[PDB]
Amino acid sequence: SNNVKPQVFNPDNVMMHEKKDGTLMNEFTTPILQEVMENSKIMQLGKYEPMEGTRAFKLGVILPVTKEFLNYTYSQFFEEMKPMIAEAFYKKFDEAGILNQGNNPFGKSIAQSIEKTNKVIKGDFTQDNIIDLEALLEDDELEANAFISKTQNRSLLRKIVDPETKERIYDRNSDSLDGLPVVNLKSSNLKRGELITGDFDKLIYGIPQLIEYKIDETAQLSTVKNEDGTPVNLFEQDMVALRATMHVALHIADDKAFAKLVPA
Amino acid sequence: SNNVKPQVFNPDNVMMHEKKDGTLMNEFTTPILQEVMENSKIMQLGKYEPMEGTEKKFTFWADKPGAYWVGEGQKIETSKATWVNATMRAFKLGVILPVTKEFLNYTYSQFFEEMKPMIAEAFYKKFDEAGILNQGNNPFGKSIAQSIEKTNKVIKGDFTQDNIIDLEALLEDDELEANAFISKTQNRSLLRKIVDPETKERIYDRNSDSLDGLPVVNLKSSNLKRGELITGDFDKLIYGIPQLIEYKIDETAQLSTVKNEDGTPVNLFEQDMVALRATMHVALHIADDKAFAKLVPA
Amino acid sequence: EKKFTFWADKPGAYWVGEGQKIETSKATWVNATM
Amino acid sequence: IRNQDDETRLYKSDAMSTFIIYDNTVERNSIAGVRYLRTKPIDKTDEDEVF
Secondary structure: OOOOOOEEEEEEOOOEEEEEOOEEEOOOOOOOOOOOOOOOOOHHOOOOOOOOOOEEEEEEEEEEEEHHHHHHOOHHHHHHHHHHHHHHHHHHHHHHHHHHOOOOOOOOOOHHHHHHHHEEEEEEOOOHHHHHHHHHOOOOOOOOOOEEHHHHEEEEEEEEOOOOEEEOOOOOOOOOOEEEEEEEEOOOOOOOOOOOEEEEEEEEEOOOOOEEEEOOOEEEEEEEEEEOOOOOEEOOOOEEEEEEEEEEEEEOOOOOEEEEEEEO | OOOOOOOOOOOOOOOOEEEOOOOEOOOOOOOOOOOOOOHHHHHHHHHHOOOOOOOEEEEEEEHHHHHHOOOOOOOOOOOOOOEEEEEEEEEEEEEEEEHHHHHHHHHOOHHHHHHHHHHHHHHHHHHHHHOOOOOOOOOOOHHHHHHHHHHEEEEEEEOHHHHHHHHHHHHHOOOOOOOEEEEEEEHHHHOOOOEEOOOEEEOOOOOOOOEEEEEEEOOOOOOOOOOOOOOOOHHHHHEEEEEEEEEEEOOOOOEEEEEEEEOOEEEEEOOOOOEEEEEEEEEEEOOOOHHHEEEOOO | OOOEEEEEOOOOOEEEEOOOOOOOOOEEEEEEOO | OEEEOOOOOOOOOOOEEEEEEEEEOOOOEEEEEEOOOHHHHHHOOOOOOOO
16 A cells, blocks of 8 residues: 555554564564464364264454565464464364353353253362262263363362372372373463363264365455555455364263362 | 354345254255256357457448440440448356355355356347347347337238248348248247148148248247247348356455345455356347348237 | 255346446255155 | 286376375385375366365
């Protein structure tokens, strides 16, 4: 466009070579992934279901980039970013299926299963409360398969020792509690003192369409307005965008197979 | 927003996997086409003309020199030749079919391939009804029905050996001979029940679809009424096709003619849609407005 | 029991001036059962 | 390849569509080879991107 000051976008999601203050990221050193890539927990715990068609829903995102940014600041951006989109989808799916958060489209979730069956234990972390949590499952002939926890509570788990064998019930190196593997959730919605468990073979998922990536240079982005309010034209403004889409489907075969421990 | 309900469009031309009541159309048995695909009757009867550009020029002799008896040693009078020019231009047919990605993956994977025939058929019919009947917003300033209107070369009355002979004679009154008939299949009932009282032979072949020895072509259009019949020297009807049906599928552009529920134009990329565009260039020319005649019920 | 599906609407077509906006049209089908 | 007519045949493989994955050791034995090709009709209707 004819604006010589950098283009203000609404929302400000477009990547730019020149900051609002006019700083130019020339000779810019490539970032590094100081944190490890996260992985989908319900895809780790749950049972895969061969599917076509069906109930699924579509995840998607579009990342717009200024072609000056794509030429001078960081040429390999799109290739380095595909892992990061896949992570964002995994976190969105996990948060919907487990915690019933993020405007989940399904009418099914572990949080709803637990809230329906009222299979909740009020209490602090103790060997007796861990056993009670497991017994809420074995009452209905179902045996716990794994634990889901906020990583920030290992400080509580290390303080529990079996008064018979006089040893730690929690193996901090194996990250397994009472012999069962504990998976960690990075999401902000699962609180410090909360722990979830169930026979995750009763949680079923499917993926009709794996992540699809298209890169385009001539679409219009009606969802992003120029400062003047006109929609962004990729070609006309010399800009590029990447579209990612995915389909996921979720089913819970037995909603009594999950139990939750929560602070009193 | 995270609004997961499916997008309503206006007009409702977009194909979709999900009905807005929440039904998904899995296990969809693809429709089977019953009816036969119709050919262009203009391409059947008329004369083709190779046409590279969007326009074509014709030139014909018009005047031929006289001749004089001259006495021995008299001055030989001069004479003169003359020519005339005519021209024809092309017009573009087209249509677009919009389809949602999810439909085109989970309901009808082959959908665009089974549309190409029906699009070709729709183009042919649009062309026939334009050139023959001057119907359907004829782009050309030319047509059979319009030549008939300017010449008033119309016979009034019932299908009879009398009127059909008169109809064909109306062409040789201009030194032209009829070459075929255009009729509505509804009326072969009438043609089937007319017989010569003298030779006691029928004028219409029910077996060969020949009327008075000339071939009959049937229109499927509803504009040509049962009681109406058309004839002409169809070698005088010239048509050209600068560009055969081109198909292009697009995954990225905008369709302004279809609007979202909120009134925004449909963006194919940003909405994850696919659309098929078909276009064709066709040209039509009446070489002699007098070469056509029509029989109409009184 | 038997079930059939037939094409029920043919897509329209339009005459379009030089660079005029081409309009859209839709096919349709109907279901029958025996 | 051992042909259907039971004969040993030798065919060149295009460089733009073939590559080999080698053992990481200094010996670099070839572990596995791959070939991949775009499959298309000549009418170029739609998605060229199937391999």
